[PDB]
Point group: D2
Chain length 150, copies 4
């Protein structure tokens, strides 16, 4: 009964534990870690002109960390894409987010991070904004979904 946003996804599997950051007014910074798949994933959002830190979604796997810094508000995501598949190590197992790639309205590209292994997904946005992320994390990013608004 509170305020809601359009939500697309998830892409990824049933594994790991639900999270949902909720909705805000834009993206400032995305922080992720990666190796053979995506590990950690966390976001500094914009909330009405000031940063808001989302709950951290940390894998303790010793992965490479990266800070994607957007030129907010003039720069914003126009595409979120990536690959989903199992990672061999979880014995018998369930699809995770192997790769993420981001494009901005400025023509910047971030990534691809991880390994482009498995089934492709792609959210090209023609009109609208990413205003929040949701997903599932175990030892790593099992699934990812986006909230959108105008």
């Amino acid at each position: 009964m509170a305020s809601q946003t359009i939500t697309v996804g998830p892409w990824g599997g049933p594994g790991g534990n639900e999270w949902d950051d909720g909705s805000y007014t834009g993206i400032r910074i995305i922080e992720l870690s990666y190796k053979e798949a995506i590990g950690s994933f966390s976001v500094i959002y914009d909330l009405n002109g000031e940063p808001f830190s989302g709950s951290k979604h940390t894998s303790k796997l010793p992965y490479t960390n990266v800070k994607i810094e957007l030129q907010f508000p003039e720069e914003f995501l126009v595409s979120v894409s990536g690959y989903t598949a199992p990672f061999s190590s979880l014995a018998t197992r369930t699809p995770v987010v192997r790769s993420l790639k981001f494009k901005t309205n400025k023509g910047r590209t971030f990534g691809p991070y991880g390994e482009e292994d498995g089934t492709y997904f792609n959210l090209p946005i023609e009109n609208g904004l990413v205003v929040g992320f949701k997903g599932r994390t175990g030892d790593l990013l099992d699934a990812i979904g986006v909230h959108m608004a105008l």
Copy 2:
């Protein structure tokens, strides 16, 4: 540029200094002060299930303080109304918000607070939710407007 909401108003006059709390997921508490007019006006928002304290828009005048606590999220505002006019010592030239009055979907009325003098304003909400307030404040609540989503 960042996420936007439907915004109605303002009601009141061009005095004091502008402010805009922006948009959130809902309303938990409204804090105001009053006597002949509205003084202080501040809001505790809901942002994704937790409280978020908006910026204070305080008056130093010795007015009566009231704290409006809604049972969010099942309770919500379905009307905002009030009167605007000069208050003929500190706002001789421009109208301020003299009164405010809120109704909820559970049939609680809060107010009228202040004095019911001058030009009526009335926003019944048939569908949608008040997500944020903006206004103008000097020693008094010169102006107010509302951001809406759903």
Copy 3:
């Protein structure tokens, strides 16, 4: 169920029979009739770049006909306002729409139509667009409300 819009109002009384044109993409023309109150009310909407005629909410009373033609798409409404009150030769007793006035982003004012008797209502719009009207009609316009979108 089906897609929805933010809707505000009603302004007016409970007589007459309810009607709801629904939501569209914008406004091309408003047709009304007036004398001491508003009679007829009907709209030619924009629907994805072509006109779409709303049901006619006509009155048989001997009133003056007005057509408000907007320069769509560049011209849109930014204020809907008016007055409500009972009307003397009313076989019943409850409030009707005595007057309506509209302003646009091009600084055109259409009206007041009717008489400015009774209780004032005013919807300034700072962000978003009139995408439909609802109301109540008998021999006169008993009430009026507005759907809004981005």
Copy 4:
């Protein structure tokens, strides 16, 4: 412009003429034709409780026609997916939509129609409704996108 919706995609290629049906209040019927790719694509939308026929984007090619009738408003689309790739049979090997598939909230699957050749696409919708389709059609369905609303 006039009123807007969140728009995602397009998926497919830059061939054949632009079309955009715009936005409505939901979907009733989708009509398409298929064989090696999608040819024809047209939609009967809901508009405020009544059917509204979108513009026809017919293919002349001698393809198999199908009619997808959703039990509107209780049933609606929760996934749009498909495949894009060039089609040997046009000399222009600009990518067209080779197949589509539609799932609903009741567990119905319509498709796949056409052949599942080239790059997958997939829009699963967690919250929100498809209100509109946009695309590109020459000989065949070159590309497709969706408008979403709440």
